[PDB]
Design a protein around this nucleic acid. Structure first.
Lengths: 206, 216, 129, 87, 25, 94, 121
RNA sequence: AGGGGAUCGAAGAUGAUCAGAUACCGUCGUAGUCUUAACCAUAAACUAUGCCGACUAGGGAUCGGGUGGUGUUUUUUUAAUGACCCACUCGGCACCUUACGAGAAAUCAAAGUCUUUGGGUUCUGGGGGGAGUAUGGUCGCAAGGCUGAAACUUAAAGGAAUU
C-alpha cells in the first residue's frame, strides 16, 4: 500500500501542465497504449497526466529497489536530452552512457566499453532501438519514456511522456530523479520542495 | 592464472557457487569456459569429423578446417559448438571452448513404470534445424540408444541409456543433425508435464545476495 | 463451410495458448463441446469457463489459465476396439503417466484411463495433454 | 516427481513466470527478474526483502510485459486504479 | 536451342509421316 | 526467382491493361508498365528569356509552357540513363 | 598529405589524459618532454607525435573535443551540472501563477485534482 | 462464305552492312490486323500460390455503402441536397514495419494454426532424357485439340545464396 501522499498536488500539476507533458502525437496511435483520453479536433491527442505521474513512481519504485546506486544507467542517443542524464549521473551516482552508445557494451566482454547493468532508462525507443535490442540478449529490465506514437516492444516499464519538447523531457527527467532521491531518503520530508530546478536539465540552443 | 573479468567468475573462484544447477535454474548470461570446467571436472570431448571449406578468390584456395565438437558427461550435462579454423589443432581447441560454453541440462525420466532411477525421456521431443528434424521417443528398458552413429554416441554421453530416434530429410548433412538434436534436447525442458504443476516461490538470484563479491 | 464444430472451436484455444491468451471467445456453442470441457475441467486442467445462452446457438467464453501446451481433435471419428486403446496412447501422447485420450461411449464422454477401467471401448473424440 | 523410496530425483526445478505460467529455459536469455522494495509506514524503503517478479522473454517479445506487470502489482495490492479489468 | 523449334520440328515430322501414311493407307 | 512484390509493374487485381507504344523505339508496352516522365520545360530554351523580351510584342507576360508525357520502354530507359539498376536495399524505395 | 596515421593518433591521446599541465602550448618545450616519459627510439618519429598532441592543445584551448578525458574535462562537467536557475523555475511563474490551458484540459483536472489553479483560454 | 480494305504488316520484291545475311537498319508490298454468320478450345490463359469455413502483431492511405458528431462549406447566411472533416463499421484491389509461426532460402498475415503430424473437398508429380513422342481411340473442313506409352540411355540434371 501507499500513504496516499503521492497524489498529484497543484504545484506538481502546475509544472506538468505548463511544460506541455499532456499533448500527444497526431492521429497515428499504437493500440498498445490505452492511456489516451480524447483529442484536440485539430489532430493533437491528449494523454492523462494522472496516469503518467502514477506510473512514474512505479518506475521510480523499481529504480531505487536496486541496492547499489551505481549499477543504474541511462541512454540518451538523441542530443536533445543530452545534459539531462549527467544530472542523474551527478546526484545519485550511476555512470553516464550519454552521447554515443558503443555497439557491444552489453554482450562483448573484451571491449573497453563493457558495462553490466541491471536496469536501463531510455528517452525515445525509436531513436535508440539499438540499446533495447542489444540489452534483450542479457535479460535486463529496461525503462522507456515512450510517446503514444512510439513502439512499446521489449520494455516492461514505459513512461508515457512528450518527446518533442524541451519543457517536457527536461521536466520528466527531473521528476524521475526527484522521488528516487526522496524514496532513498536523502530528502527526508516529502513535502519539502527540492532546491534543484528542471531548467538545469534543459539543453541550451547554443 | 585466471584473474576473472566477469561477475560469475568471481563467485565460483570465491567458492560461493558449488553446483551447476544454480546457473541453469536462474539462466544468468555466462560466456566464460573457466566456470564450466571448474564446476564439473569430469567432461569428455568428442569430434565427429572435419569438413574442409575454402574461400574462392582471385587466385587459388586457402582451405580451412571446420571442426564440430561435442563435450558432455554422461550424467545430464552436454554442450555443442561449431568453429572454423585454418589448422586442425586450433579448430578442435576452439570447438571445445564453445561447446563447453554451451552446456545444456537434459530432463531424465522414464518411458513410465516408476520403480527405479531415470533411464529415458518423459515426452517425445523434436527440433527442426535446417531441413532435418530428429525425434526422441521414450523406450522400454534394455532397448538401447537406436540412432545414427554420430547421434547415438551424442546421446550416449547425454546420460540417457535408451531412446527411439526418427529422422526426416537429408540426414547426410551431419552438422545439421546435431544442432537439430541440440535444440531438441534443450526443448525437452520446455514441455509442461503434469508433475511440475504446483506453484513455487520464485527464488532470489545468487548475484544479489552476493553483491559485494562482484566487480571492483 | 462449417464441418466439425468441435474442430473449429478447439483450434482457437490452441491458437489462444500459442499467443498466451488467458481468455478466448468460442462460438459453435454445442453440447458435444460442452461435455468436452466438463471432463476437461475435472482434472483441473483449465480454469472456469462460461457458456452464453440465447435464442440461437450461443457463445462460449473460457477463462483459461496458462498451463496447457497442445490440444487436438482427430477427425474421422474412428471406431476403436479395446485392443487399440493402448495403440493410440503410444503414437499420440507423450507417455502413459499423463495425457488423456478423450473418447465417448454409450455411457457418456470420459477419458481413456477410466475407460479401460470400464473395460468398454467407444468412440474416439480426441487427446488432451 | 517421485520414486518408491522417497528421494526426489532430478535437479533444478525451474521457476515459473509470474504473469503466464510457462517454463523458463536455461538457454532462454530473455527472462528478467524484477524485485520491488517494501514501504513501512514512514515511507523509507527497507532493504533485504523483496517481492519476486519472474517474467519470461516470451512476454517481453510482444511488448505486453508492461501490461502484465500491472495486474500482479494490482492483485498484490501494490497498485490502486491503473488497469481496469473491463476494457 | 529453344522450345518452339523442338515443337516445329516435331510437327513437321508428324506432317511428313501423315503424308506417308495417307500415301500407304 | 521472383524479383519484385508487384511482379511486373503494379498489375494486381486487374489481369490485363491496354498496351501503348514507346516514343523512342516504338515498343508495345503496357500502360502501367511504361514509365511516364513529365516534360514541363518552357517553350523557350534555357535562360535567354530577355533576348526574346527585347523583341517581344506587348510587355511580355506571355511565359508559355509546354507539357508532354514521355512513354519509355525498359531497354530505352536504361539507355537514356533515366532509371538505373538499384541495390537490393535501395530497390524498396519508391 | 599532412594527415597523420593511426599509431600517432592512438599514442597522442595517451599523454593528455594524465599529462594536461605538462603539455605546454609551446612546441619547443614539449617536443623533447615526450621523450622523457614516452620511450621513442626514433628522432624522426618523436617529432610528429609531439606535434600532434601540441596541435590538440591549440584546439582544446578553444574548446573540448570527442573522447579525450584528460582528468579535467570531468572537472568542468561536474561544474557545469549545477546551473540552478534562481527565479525562472517554470512553476508559480511564466504566467500569472495560473495555467493557460484548454477547455478539454479542465476534465483532466476535475477528474481527481480539481482543487488546483485553472484558466481555460 | 461475304462486307470492308485507310495505317501497320508472317510471305515476297528490294537497298545497304558483313568473307557470307534470304536477319537485326530503310522503301514498297500479299494474307492478316475492322465487321457480319459458322468453326478453331490453345499461352508466361502467372498472384507460376485450387475452392469453402474459423482464428492469429500492428499503422496509414485508397474504392463503394452506411451511421453519428448546431463539424466546415455550398444559396434565397439559414430550410435539405452536394463536396469534404472527424470517429466507427462492412465488403473490396491492396500497401508499410516486424516474425510468436512457416520455409532450403529468395520470402510469406499467408507460403501461419505440419512431427505438438487429422476442419471438408477436387486435380497433378515420383531422377533427368527419350517425349508430351509411338500407337490406339476421340472433336475438328484442315491446321490442330483431348487421352497417352514403351524400348533404350545416363549418375548426374534441377531449386535457393556466396567469393
Amino acid at each position: 500500500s501507499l500513504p496516499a501522499t503521492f497524489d498529484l498536488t497543484p504545484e506538481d500539476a502546475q509544472l506538468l501542465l505548463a511544460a506541455n507533458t499532456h499533448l500527444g502525437a497526431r492521429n497515428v496511435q499504437v493500440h498498445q497504449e490505452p492511456y489516451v483520453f480524447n483529442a484536440r479536433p485539430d489532430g493533437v491527442h491528449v494523454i492523462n497526466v494522472g496516469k503518467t505521474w502514477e506510473k512514474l513512481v512505479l518506475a521510480a519504485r523499481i529504480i531505487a529497489a536496486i541496492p547499489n546506486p551505481e549499477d543504474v544507467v541511462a541512454i540518451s542517443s538523441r542530443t536533445f536530452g543530452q545534459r539531462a542524464v549527467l544530472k542523474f549521473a551527478a546526484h545519485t551516482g550511476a555512470t553516464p552512457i550519454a552521447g554515443r552508445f558503443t555497439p557491444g557494451s552489453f554482450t562483448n566482454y573484451i571491449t573497453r566499453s563493457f558495462k553490466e547493468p541491471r536496469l536501463v532508462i531510455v528517452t525515445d525507443p525509436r531513436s535508440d532501438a539499438q540499446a533495447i535490442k542489444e540489452a534483450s540478449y542479457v535479460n535486463i529490465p529496461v525503462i522507456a519514456l515512450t510517446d503514444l506514437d512510439s513502439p512499446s516492444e521489449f520494455v516492461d516499464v514505459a513512461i508515457p511522456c512528450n518527446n518533442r519538447g524541451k519543457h517536457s523531457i527536461g521536466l520528466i527527467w527531473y521528476l524521475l530523479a526527484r522521488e528516487v532521491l526522496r524514496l532513498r531518503g536523502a530528502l527526508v520530508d516529502r513535502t519539502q520542495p527540492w532546491s534543484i530546478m528542471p531548467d538545469l536539465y534543459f539543453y541550451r540552443d547554443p | 592464472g585466471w584473474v576473472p573479468v566477469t561477475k560469475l567468475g568471481r563467485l565460483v573462484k570465491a567458492g560461493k557457487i558449488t553446483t551447476i544447477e544454480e546457473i541453469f535454474l536462474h539462466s544468468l548470461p555466462v560466456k566464460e569456459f573457466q566456470i564450466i570446467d571448474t564446476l564439473l571436472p569430469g567432461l569428455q570431448d568428442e569430434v565427429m569429423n572435419i569438413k574442409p571449406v575454402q574461400k574462392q578468390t582471385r587466385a587459388g584456395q586457402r582451405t580451412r578446417f571446420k571442426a564440430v565438437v561435442v563435450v558432455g558427461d554422461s550424467n545430464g550435462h552436454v554442450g555443442l559448438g561449431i568453429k572454423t579454423a585454418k589448422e586442425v589443432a586450433g579448430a578442435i581447441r576452439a570447438g571445445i571452448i564453445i561447446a563447453k560454453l554451451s552446456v545444456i541440462p537434459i530432463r531424465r525420466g522414464y518411458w513410465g513404470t516408476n520403480l527405479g532411477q531415470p533411464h529415458s525421456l518423459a515426452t517425445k521431443t523434436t527440433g527442426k534445424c535446417g531441413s532435418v528434424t530428429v525425434r526422441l521417443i521414450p523406450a522400454p528398458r534394455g532397448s538401447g540408444i537406436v540412432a545414427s552413429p554420430a547421434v547415438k554416441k551424442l546421446l550416449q554421453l547425454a546420460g540417457v541409456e535408451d531412446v527411439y530416434t526418427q529422422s526426416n530429410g537429408k540426414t547426410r548433412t551431419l552438422e545439421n543433425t546435431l544442432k537439430a538434436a541440440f535444440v531438441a534436447i534443450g526443448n525437452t525442458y520446455g514441455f509442461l508435464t503434469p508433475n511440475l504443476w504446483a506453484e513455487q516461490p520464485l527464488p532470489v538470484s545468487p548475484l544479489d545476495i552476493y553483491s559485494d563479491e562482484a566487480s571492483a | 463451410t462449417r464441418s466439425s464444430v468441435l474442430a473449429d472451436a478447439l483450434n482457437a484455444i490452441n491458437n489462444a495458448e500459442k499467443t498466451g491468451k488467458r481468455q478466448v471467445l468460442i462460438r459453435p456453442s454445442s453440447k458435444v463441446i460442452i461435455k468436452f470441457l466438463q471432463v476437461m475441467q475435472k482434472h483441473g486442467y483449465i480454469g472456469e469457463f462460461e457458456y452464453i445462452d440465447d435464442h440461437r446457438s450461443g457463445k462460449i467464453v473460457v477463462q483459461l489459465n496458462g498451463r496447457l501446451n497442445k490440444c487436438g481433435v482427430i477427425s474421422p471419428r474412428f471406431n476403436v476396439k479395446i485392443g487399440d486403446i493402448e495403440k493410440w496412447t503410444a503414437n499420440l501422447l507423450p507417455a502413459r503417466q499423463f495425457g488423456y485420450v478423450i473418447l465417448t461411449t454409450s455411457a457418456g464422454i470420459m477419458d481413456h484411463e477410466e475407460a479401460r477401467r470400464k473395460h468398454v471401448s467407444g468412440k474416439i473424440l480426441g487427446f488432451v495433454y | 516427481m517421485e520414486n518408491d523410496k522417497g528421494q526426489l530425483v532430478e535437479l533444478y526445478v525451474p521457476r515459473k513466470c509470474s504473469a503466464t505460467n510457462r517454463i523458463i529455459k536455461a538457454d532462454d536469455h530473455a527472462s528478467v527478474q524484477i524485485n520491488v522494495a517494501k514501504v513501512d509506514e514512514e515511507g523509507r524503503a527497507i532493504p533485504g526483502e523483496y517481492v519476486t517478479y519472474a517474467l519470461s522473454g516470451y512476454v517481453r517479445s510482444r511488448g505486453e510485459s508492461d501490461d502484465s506487470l500491472n495486474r500482479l502489482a494490482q492483485n498484490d495490492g501494490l497498485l490502486k486504479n491503473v488497469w481496469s479489468y473491463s476494457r | 536451342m529453344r522450345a518452339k523449334w523442338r515443337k516445329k520440328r516435331t510437327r513437321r515430322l508428324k506432317r511428313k509421316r501423315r503424308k506417308v501414311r495417307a500415301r500407304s493407307k | 526467382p521472383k524479383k519484385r512484390a508487384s511482379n511486373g509493374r503494379n498489375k494486381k487485381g486487374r489481369g490485363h491493361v491496354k498496351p501503348v507504344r514507346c516514343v523512342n523505339c516504338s515498343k508495345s508496352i503496357p500502360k502501367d508498365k511504361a514509365i511516364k516522365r513529365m516534360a514541363i520545360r518552357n517553350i523557350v530554351e534555357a535562360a535567354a528569356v530577355r533576348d526574346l523580351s527585347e523583341a517581344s510584342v506587348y510587355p511580355e507576360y506571355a511565359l508559355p509552357k509546354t507539357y508532354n508525357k514521355l512513354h519509355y520502354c525498359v531497354s530505352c530507359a536504361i539507355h537514356a540513363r533515366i532509371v538505373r539498376v538499384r541495390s537490393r536495399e535501395d530497390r524498396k524505395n519508391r | 598529405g599532412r594527415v597523420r596515421t593511426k599509431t600517432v593518433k592512438r599514442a597522442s591521446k595517451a599523454l593528455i589524459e594524465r599529462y594536461y599541465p605538462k603539455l605546454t602550448l609551446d612546441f619547443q618545450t614539449n617536443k623533447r618532454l615526450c621523450d622523457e616519459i614516452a620511450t621513442i627510439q626514433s628522432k624522426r618519429l618523436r617529432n610528429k607525435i609531439a606535434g600532434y598532441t601540441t596541435h590538440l592543445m591549440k584546439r582544446i584551448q578553444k574548446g573540448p573535443v570527442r573522447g579525450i578525458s584528460f582528468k579535467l574535462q570531468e572537472e568542468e562537467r561536474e561544474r557545469k551540472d549545477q546551473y540552478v536557475p534562481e527565479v525562472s523555475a517554470l512553476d508559480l511563474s511564466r504566467s500569472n501563477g495560473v495555467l493557460n490551458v484548454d477547455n478539454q484540459t479542465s476534465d483532466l483536472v476535475k477528474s481527481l485534482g480539481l482543487k488546483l489553479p485553472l484558466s481555460v483560454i
